[PDB]
Structure formats: C-alpha cells, structure tokens
C-alpha cells in the first residue's frame, strides 16, 4: 500500500493589508495630511495629533460585522473629546475623507510584488484572503489594482465568518478545487492569517514579520516567519520537496 513521496503547494492564500499593500504605512500619511489640514488650515496646536491618535484606537476597536458613518463619527468624537463643543460632522468628513483619499493613493503593489505574484501564478493558485468590511477592502484592491493577480478574491465581509474561523478557509479552498492541505496561507496577523491557518488544517502557515521580533506570550506558532512576502517562493519551492507518507 503506503509509500513516501511529495505533496505540492497547490494554491497559496494572501492577505492583502501589510502584506503586499503598506497599510499601515499610508495610514501614518493619511494621518499626516490629517494633521497638515487641521494645524494649517483650522490652526490646531498639538490636539491635532490628539485626536488622530484617539482615531487611530477608535478604528482598531472596531468589530466585525455602513462603513463611512462610522468612520466619520471616530473623527467626529474624536474631535469633540479633544475640542470639545458640538459636534462637527462637516469637519469630521474633511479629516475621514482626506485619511481615506492619502491612504488609498498610498496603497500600491511593488513591482518585485508584482513579479513575485506573476511567477507564482504560473504554478499555483493565487488567492487574495482579506479580512474587513466589504467596501473597505474593495477600494483598496482597487487602488492598489492587484485583481488581476489572483485567481479569486475572498473578502471576510462578505463571508458568514472571517479569519480566523476556519469555515473562511475552507470556502476558498472549495473555491479553487483544492483540499486545505495543499494550500499555504501567508499574512503578517497571528491571531487571524496563522491561527486561521492552524484552525484550518492548511499545509502551512507563513507569518510576514518585518521586524523580525517575535512575542514573549503564548500565541500561535506559523510554521515559517519571513520579512517579506519577496521570500515566498524559496518556500514554496522547499515545500515541495518535502517529503511524507503517501
Ligand atoms: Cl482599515
Ligand atoms: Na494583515
């Protein structure tokens, strides 16, 4: 009956946000023009950060579920907790709107990205697995312009359940033929792209940690860590060679 032998990577699953698009970084900027408009033109002091950064948390205490309402009112209590006064939706919706233009026009595929994503593509499925509100993602894969890289897209706003409940996974899995164990999932989240991974059965799990530093707590365990999605494919190409029982 059973024989060694290899099992390749048939399909590899991405994230999207500060994995192949700097979001973090275009927010910062969009932050900046934030505090340009407010300091310059409505002659803010040190408040203007103020109220950024409480932004900046208001956003991150979101949960998943009429994006620009909400949004608008992070700026819009923001601003009020920091200035006080009635609220101010008008300036409210300068500052959101202005963070969201800054960081979408920020939000760009490196052309080493996009020659990695090409080659890749030749040899595996790719599919783009990001978390988020549907209109959110979808202007960010538009602005960055990265549909045509992949074989599907999966947005966990338009999923019953996001990363890392592993029913996501397995629908992008259906999705593309393949079984969980033939497909690599790669994200710079613990908690959600490798703990998703884990939950998932996937054959393996690529933490992107810039850095390089890794927490003192219990956590989830990838099975690789890298800087940069760039070191993919010596990956893949190793798993591939990897050898189990048939
Ligand atoms: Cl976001
Ligand atoms: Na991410």
Not at 147 to 172: L, M, R, W
Not at 211 to 233: A, D, F, I, K, W
């Amino acid at each position: 009956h059973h024989h060694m032998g290899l099992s390749r990577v048939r399909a590899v699953f991405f994230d999207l946000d500060n994995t192949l698009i700097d979001t973090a970084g275009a927010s910062r900027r969009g932050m900046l023009e934030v505090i340009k408009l407010l300091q310059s033109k409505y002659h803010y002091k040190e408040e203007a950060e103020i109220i950024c950064d409480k932004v900046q948390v208001k956003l991150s205490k979101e949960c998943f579920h009429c994006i620009t309402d909400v949004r608008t009112s992070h700026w819009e209590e923001a601003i009020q907790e920091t200035k006080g006064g009635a609220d101010n939706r008008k300036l409210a919706e300068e500052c959101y709107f202005l963070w969201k233009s800054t960081r979408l026009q920020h939000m760009i595929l490196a052309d080493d990205v996009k020659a990695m994503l090409t080659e890749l593509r030749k040899e595996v499925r790719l599919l783009l697995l990001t978390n988020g509100d549907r209109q959110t993602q979808r202007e960010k894969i538009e602005a960055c312009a990265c549909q045509s890289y992949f074989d599907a897209i999966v947005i966990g706003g338009e999923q019953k359940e996001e990363k890392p409940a592993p029913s996501i996974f397995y629908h992008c899995c259906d999705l593309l033929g393949v079984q969980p164990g033939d497909c690599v999932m790669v994200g710079d989240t613990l908690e959600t792209d490798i703990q998703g991974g884990l939950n998932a059965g996937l054959k393996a799990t690529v933490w992107i940690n810039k850095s390089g530093r890794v927490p003192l707590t219990s956590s989830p365990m990838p099975h690789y860590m890298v800087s940069s999605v760039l070191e993919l494919p010596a990956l893949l190409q190793s798993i591939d060679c990897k050898v189990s029982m048939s």
